[PDB]
Amino acid sequence: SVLTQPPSASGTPGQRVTISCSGSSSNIGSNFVYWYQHFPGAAPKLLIYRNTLRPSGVPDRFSGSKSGTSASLAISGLRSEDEADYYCAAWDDSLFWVFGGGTKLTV
Amino acid sequence: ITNLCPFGEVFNATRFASVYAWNRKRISNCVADYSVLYNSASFSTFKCYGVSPTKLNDLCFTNVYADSFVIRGDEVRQIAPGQTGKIADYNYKLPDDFTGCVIAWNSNNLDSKVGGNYNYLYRLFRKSNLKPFERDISTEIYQAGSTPCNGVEGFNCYFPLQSYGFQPTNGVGYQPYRVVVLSFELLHAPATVCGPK
Amino acid sequence: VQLVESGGGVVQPGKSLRLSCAASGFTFSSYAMHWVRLAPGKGLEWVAVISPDGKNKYYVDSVKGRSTISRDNSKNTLYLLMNSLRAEDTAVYYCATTQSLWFGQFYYIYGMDVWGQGTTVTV
Numbered sequence A: 001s002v003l004t005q006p007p008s009a010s011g012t013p014g015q016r017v018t019i020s021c022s023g024s025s026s027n028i029g030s031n032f033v034y035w036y037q038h039f040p041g042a043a044p045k046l047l048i049y050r051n052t053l054r055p056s057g058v059p060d061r062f063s064g065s066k067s068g069t070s071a072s073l074a075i076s077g078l079r080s081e082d083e084a085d086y087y088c089a090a091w092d093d094s095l096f097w098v099f100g101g102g103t104k105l106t107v
Numbered sequence B: 001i002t003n004l005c006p007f008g009e010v011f012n013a014t015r016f017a018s019v020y021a022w023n024r025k026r027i028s029n030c031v032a033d034y035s036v037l038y039n040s041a042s043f044s045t046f047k048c049y050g051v052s053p054t055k056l057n058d059l060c061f062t063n064v065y066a067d068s069f070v071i072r073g074d075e076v077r078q079i080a081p082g083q084t085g086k087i088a089d090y091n092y093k094l095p096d097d098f099t100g101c102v103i104a105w106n107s108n109n110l111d112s113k114v115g116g117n118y119n120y121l122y123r124l125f126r127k128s129n130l131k132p133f134e135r136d137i138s139t140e141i142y143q144a145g146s147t148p149c150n151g152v153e154g155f156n157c158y159f160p161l162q163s164y165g166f167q168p169t170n171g172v173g174y175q176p177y178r179v180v181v182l183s184f185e186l187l188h189a190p191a192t193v194c195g196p197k
Numbered sequence C: 001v002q003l004v005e006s007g008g009g010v011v012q013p014g015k016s017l018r019l020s021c022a023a024s025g026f027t028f029s030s031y032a033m034h035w036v037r038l039a040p041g042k043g044l045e046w047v048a049v050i051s052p053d054g055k056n057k058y059y060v061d062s063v064k065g066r067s068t069i070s071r072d073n074s075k076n077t078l079y080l081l082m083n084s085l086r087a088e089d090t091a092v093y094y095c096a097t098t099q100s101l102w103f104g105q106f107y108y109i110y111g112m113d114v115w116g117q118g119t120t121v122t123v
């Protein structure tokens, strides 16, 4: 996993938590990074694609942005039922789909 | 010799255009000194598809076009006849037959501020391969498949312009490179640009 | 858009396995398929990408030259063949369908969109 992420994060329910995904200039720069969530014992789902868009059926709380060779995601109005692992995946310039280490969120 | 060409204006410039709308300057009616710019070694890559550079001052033309833009250091080779990719396919493609020189020099120090530049954008996802010497400033949202997006963004509808991630420290690969293409044209009118007598 | 998988039984090291992903609810020939894996105690790891036409495909470095990806449009099926497995290969493997319609050879806009059920594999 070329990408690096904080080992875990947590907070109170509703202080606009943030998660940062760090990577080199050949993975998350000059390309796009998509953020998915993995529930315990359930199939992963797409949350953010193209660094700003969102798919149908996903609330407006989740937001994402890129600030150069690194991306960030923000969840406002966090609820107790958002426990999951958040993965940031980008396309390496050469041949790869580099995945992030993960982010174990707790409330 | 009385008057020289304005190579300084197009070479030494602060506000330097992006690639998706590459700057074009028309040079004529002036004496051009190619020896002075060739001798200097500041230029990283100096290719000339056509006449030999050292004899450039021995040739006379009626018009020359100075295209100029900025690209990633890695993909500077794409500026040449035949080669295809993401710069010579959708942004700036030279014709298969060519006559000009392609100067390209590193500009990492002058660009790529500490927090990023973001002032250089390159086109992506063009509807069809670009014909030679065409610029497309259009920012209309791209589409594919069958469903047309009503000015919105999502699956099957992309934003064609993507920004660079220039940083002061990126390596010789992903660093800014300023490229200037000097394309001559003989046409039919009497030649104006010439070398020193 | 319903995706299911079958195969991936308990197999000892050095043997060969075939995983079959079945898709329904959309045009299977207009999308590029992705294979990924989730290993215990490790983050999601990409495995391979296969184009709808099958002419262009790519593999991850770890699984390179010891696997095969194939797709059958007529039967709407996706076959992954693994050979010469090892201890670390044990993981829950997943088949993913891109939502963006294929319109070229880019492979960075093609998203790992809505996921499959996925099946465990133990070496």
Ligand SMILES: *[C@@H]1O[C@H](CO)[C@@H](O[C@@H]2O[C@H](CO)[C@@H](O)[C@H](O)[C@H]2NC(C)=O)[C@H](O)[C@H]1NC(C)=O
Pocket: B007, B008, B011, B012, B036, B037, B040
């Ligand atoms: C662009 O600017 C550079 C730097 O100024 C020029 O390179 C030399 O600059 C010093 C002082 O700035 C002059 O004394 C030298 O004469 C310059 N070199 C040459 C070969 O003349 C550079 O010349 C400028 N560009 C052009 C086209 O003249």
